């Protein structure tokens, strides 16, 4: 196929725009999340170091609301537009159906928008996939992961973007109840997971957790260098 | 390929379509605009191939206000449309603001209006470049409008056929020191340098803009200056 009717079915049916945007997230920076017993960690690398940057602006991690954060991968500006639209919808729900929205509802809204960038020759498909995570109305941990197709599956813990697979089949090989009992080990799994893909050490991996019912707390470059604190956990106790 | 759309850049991020418009401008008629300490003169060539043509049913240099003159180098009808509707813009500016538009905001207007054609698709870029003569608070202004929407202010410039040699000729023959009356003569000299066809009275339309505002030169006056 070529230009017109930008979303055309393939001769077998392989809607080219879909997997074409799918490929867009393999050059996207690798992100990951874990749904823990009472904490949820949201880790992502930034292997475009450009150390003459302001890290504040180039976070991957955005927060949707009092009860939701996310990370993504792919075309950053498109993701920013997604985030703003989702924030608006979340505010509208909290006004009209007033309650803290559940993670599933906002994920379903995201998926509906994402898949409704498939009609209307017009609009082109979005080139992002998201890791929506947050604590519900009840305080249970939740996790949801989508793709440009429009599907909005949920995972125990998943990774997207560059080399996402290797992280995934590291993850089930190590995801267990005696890995999430402690929050420190909970984040340590993510640490090791990106260690498998990071630019050789705790280099520019930005992450934050959301413990139950308080806030999104930015895991920061503390005096201990929170990052390299857990990093050295693995350095000197992985033997 | 990658040179048919106006909507996609080249593999080198380099707009072939605008360049084709530029080449069309180069293929137009010679034109000269000379700034001077007391005015600005615009000169250009009339190419009425047959004497059956009338010079002066239609015109090459068009007034816009008391103190605005336009001249081009390209395909006439594009110039005529742009004049007709830059007039709309200036007339706005006077309607909203009880004072004639300064030349700058006019060339802002015009640059915007042509550029939007470049970035629309399905519409060809305006294949013609423009020259502007103006007089604001009593001091002369000289603008050249690039069909890409670019606009440049020049001490003096020349466009149309063989305009590179014209610009070089101007380089070694103009100074900020000049006045209007000799500016007319030197601009005529510039056109004569690259006229290819033996100046008569009736080949150049001349327009000037001083404190008394922009106004053409009658063919009587063209003869009158060419006498010496």
């Amino acid at each position: 196929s070529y230009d017109r009717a930008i979303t055309v079915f393939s001769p077998d049916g392989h809607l080219f725009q879909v997997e074409y945007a799918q490929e867009a997230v393999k050059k996207g920076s690798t992100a990951v999340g874990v749904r823990g017993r009472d904490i949820v960690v949201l880790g992502v690398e930034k292997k475009s170091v450009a150390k003459l940057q302001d890290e504040r602006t180039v976070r991957k991690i955005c927060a949707l609301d009092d009860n939701v954060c996310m990370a993504f991968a792919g075309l950053t500006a498109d993701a920013r537009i997604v985030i703003n639209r989702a924030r608006v919808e979340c505010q509208s729900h909290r006004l009209t159906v007033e309650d803290p929205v559940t993670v599933e509802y906002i994920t379903r809204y995201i998926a509906s928008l994402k898949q409704r960038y498939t009609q209307s020759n017009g609009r082109r498909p979005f080139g992002i996939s998201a890791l929506i995570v947050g604590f519900d109305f009840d305080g249970t941990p939740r996790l949801y992961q989508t793709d440009p197709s429009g599907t909005y599956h949920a995972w125990k813990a998943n990774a997207i973007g560059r080399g996402a697979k290797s992280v995934r089949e590291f993850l089930e090989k190590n995801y267990t109840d005696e890995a999430i009992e402690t929050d420190d080990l909970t984040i340590k799994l993510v640490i090791k997971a990106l260690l498998e893909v990071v630019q050789s050490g705790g280099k520019n991996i930005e992450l934050a957790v959301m413990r139950r019912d308080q806030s999104l707390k930015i895991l920061n470059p503390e005096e201990i260098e929170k990052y390299v604190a857990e990093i050295e956990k693995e350095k000197e106790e992985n033997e | 390929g990658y040179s048919f759309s106006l909507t996609t850049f080249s593999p080198s991020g380099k707009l072939v379509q605008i360049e084709y418009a530029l080449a069309a401008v180069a293929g137009g008629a010679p034109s000269v605009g000379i700034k001077a300490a007391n005015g600005v003169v615009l000169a250009t060539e009339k190419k009425q191939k047959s004497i059956l043509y009338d010079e002066r049913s239609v015109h090459k240099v068009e007034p816009i206000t008391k103190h605005i003159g336009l001249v081009y180098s390209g395909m006439g009808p594009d110039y005529r449309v742009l004049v007709h509707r830059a007039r709309k813009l200036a007339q706005q500016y006077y309607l909203v603001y009880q004072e004639p538009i300064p030349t700058a905001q006019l060339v802002q207007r015009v640059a915007s209006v042509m550029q939007e054609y470049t970035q629309s698709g399905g519409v060809r870029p305006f294949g013609v470049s423009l020259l502007i003569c103006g007089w604001n608070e009593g001091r002369p202004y000289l603008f050249q409008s690039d069909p890409s929407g670019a606009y440049f202010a020049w001490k003096a410039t020349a466009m149309g056929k063989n305009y590179v040699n014209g610009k070089t000729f101007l380089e070694k023959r103009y100074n900020e020191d000049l006045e209007l009356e000799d500016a007319i003569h030197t601009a005529i000299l510039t056109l004569k340098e690259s006229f290819e066809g033996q100046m008569t009275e009736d080949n150049i339309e001349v327009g000037i803009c001083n404190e008394a505002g922009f106004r053409r030169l009658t063919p009587t006056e063209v003869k009158d200056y060419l006498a010496a």
Binding site: - | V96, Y97, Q98, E99, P102, A104, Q105, Q108, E137
Partner: protein, 200 residues
Amino acid sequence: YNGGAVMAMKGKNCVAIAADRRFGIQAQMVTTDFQKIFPMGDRLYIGLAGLATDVQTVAQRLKFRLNLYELKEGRQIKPYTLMSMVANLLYEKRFGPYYTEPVIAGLDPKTFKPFICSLDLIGCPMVTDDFVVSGTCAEQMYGMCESLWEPNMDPDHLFETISQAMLNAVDRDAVSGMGVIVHIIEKDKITTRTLKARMD
């Protein structure tokens, strides 16, 4: 309705302008620090009077449009240019009339020439060489100027005369008054003074 008044008189390369400070809902003062005069340039001010909503609306919208104009032209606006500017803004909302009567006081950015002008509520300038007033107590204020003015006023006398005019006038209007602010635009510096007005 809300009440208030503005005024400006010219002079020897010096213009004066003044407006009261009362903000009251049609019978009752709300506060005595309400803004009616607004700076539109280095040496150009506008004073509003009328519905407080239209005052604070026209002022903000003029700030908007004039800032856009300044950035576009890159030059400080002429007083006559601003006059025609505001002459339009009231007019587009013709059948929504902004209930306000602006006045303008300013100088030439090239010569510091004295200049004042006023507008009707839909825009019809009175380019006056001596004075304009607006608001509720227009007639008293006209009366004060019509005698108190004199040609070729040096700035101190100009300030004294505007002070006396407005203090005599607004004292006689029920809905306006309660404090008078005064600005003096001279060729170089700006003086803004507050006046011991009957605060009743």
